[PDB]
Design an enzyme around this catalytic site. Structure first.
Site, PDB file in Angstrom:
ATOM      1  N   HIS A  41       0.818  -1.227   0.000  1.00 14.93           N
ATOM      2  CA  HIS A  41       0.000   0.000   0.000  1.00 14.93           C
ATOM      3  C   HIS A  41       0.856   1.284   0.000  1.00 14.93           C
ATOM      4  CE1 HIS A  41      -0.290  -1.474   4.275  1.00 14.93           C
ATOM      5  NE2 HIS A  41       0.182  -0.255   4.533  1.00 14.93           N
ATOM      6  N   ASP A  85       0.711  -8.279   1.540  1.00 16.23           N
ATOM      7  CA  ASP A  85       1.101  -6.880   1.655  1.00 16.23           C
ATOM      8  C   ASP A  85       2.629  -6.685   1.619  1.00 16.23           C
ATOM      9  OD1 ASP A  85       0.792  -4.177   1.629  1.00 16.23           O
ATOM     10  OD2 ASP A  85      -0.719  -4.100   3.278  1.00 16.23           O
ATOM     11  N   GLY A 174       1.975   5.825   9.107  1.00 20.44           N
ATOM     12  CA  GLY A 174       3.330   6.303   8.849  1.00 20.44           C
ATOM     13  C   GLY A 174       4.385   5.226   9.030  1.00 20.44           C
ATOM     14  N   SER A 176       3.783   2.025   8.199  1.00 21.06           N
ATOM     15  CA  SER A 176       3.496   1.017   7.173  1.00 21.06           C
ATOM     16  C   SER A 176       4.771   0.539   6.508  1.00 21.06           C
ATOM     17  CB  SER A 176       2.554   1.589   6.124  1.00 21.06           C
ATOM     18  OG  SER A 176       1.438   2.191   6.756  1.00 21.06           O
ATOM     19  N   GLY A 177       4.904  -0.768   6.352  1.00 18.29           N
ATOM     20  CA  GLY A 177       6.071  -1.392   5.728  1.00 18.29           C
ATOM     21  C   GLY A 177       7.332  -1.503   6.563  1.00 18.29           C
TER      22      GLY A 177
END
Ligand SMILES: *[B@]1([O])O[C]([C][N]C2=[C][C]=C(C([N])=[N])[C]=[C]2)[C]C2=[C][C]=[C][C]=C21
Length: 222
Positions: A41, A85, A174, A176-177
């Site tokens: 995403h 994801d 913020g 994410s990943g």
């Protein structure tokens, strides 16, 4: 990153800061001199990867920056459910390796049970503001079953759950990943979770890195 403290400046060489439109969008993990691992995403226009960063507000002698030649999203990403994801980012230049820029080895064995883990990132904190300094949190690998009640029919073999019962330390917008590190190895990536952020009842949901060994290698070797 909710209910956490500022990181030891030396404990996160593998950490990436992903930027878009001039603001921090995601986190990431340097896993190869030329590759950053992140969530799918996080695919946003003209990504700029900043390695060897601690304070986002100040310019640092150890910081390195790189554009993205290629962004490889797992062919089976479902944006509605966050299933698979995972994204692979080809850096423009092979990253200048130092003591503050280092790749992190990935945990290939799905069997591994080092529940003692930690999260790190620049996501929104308890005060609701984005921190300039990277935040840390020691957390534990939450059961498949607790996730099956916290999140009814939203967990797959491609997702791992993590959190802290006592304080409720969790990832947030913020982060994410960003990495889930267990036994000095990458176990997962911040994918999604609860709102407001807190792993008291409902834990944080992460991408299951062990499920993607062959995919990552076949993308690095292409
Ligand atoms: B990204 O950084 O944040 C959102 C998802 N946010 C999120 C992350 C973790 C948790 C948790 N553990 N409770 C909750 C919510 C999605 C997003 C989309 C595009 C770019 C960046 C992100």
């Amino acid at each position: 990153l909710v209910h956490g403290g500022p990181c030891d400046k030396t404990s996160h060489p593998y950490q990436a800061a992903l930027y878009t439109s001039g603001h921090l969008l995601c986190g990431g993990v340097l896993i190869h001199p030329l590759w950053v691992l992140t969530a799918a995403h996080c695919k946003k226009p003209n990504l700029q990867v900043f390695l060897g960063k601690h304070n986002l507000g100040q310019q640092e002698s150890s910081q390195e920056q790189s554009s993205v030649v290629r962004a490889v999203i797992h062919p089976d990403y479902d944006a509605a459910s966050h299933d698979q994801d995972i994204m692979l980012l080809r850096l423009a230049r092979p990253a200048k390796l130092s003591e503050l820029i280092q790749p992190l080895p990935l945990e290939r064995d799905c069997s591994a049970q080092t529940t003692s883990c930690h999260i790190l990132g620049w996501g929104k904190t308890a005060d609701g503001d984005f921190p300039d300094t990277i935040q840390c949190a020691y957390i534990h690998l939450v059961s498949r079953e607790e996730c099956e009640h916290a999140y009814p029919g939203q967990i797959t073999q491609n997702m791992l759950c993590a959190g802290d019962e006592k304080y409720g330390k969790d990832s947030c917008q913020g982060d994410s990943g960003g990495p889930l590190v267990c036994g000095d190895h990458l176990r997962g990536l911040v994918s999604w979770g609860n709102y407001p952020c807190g792993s008291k009842e409902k834990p944080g949901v992460y991408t299951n890195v062990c499920r993607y060994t062959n995919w990552i290698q076949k993308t690095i070797q292409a």
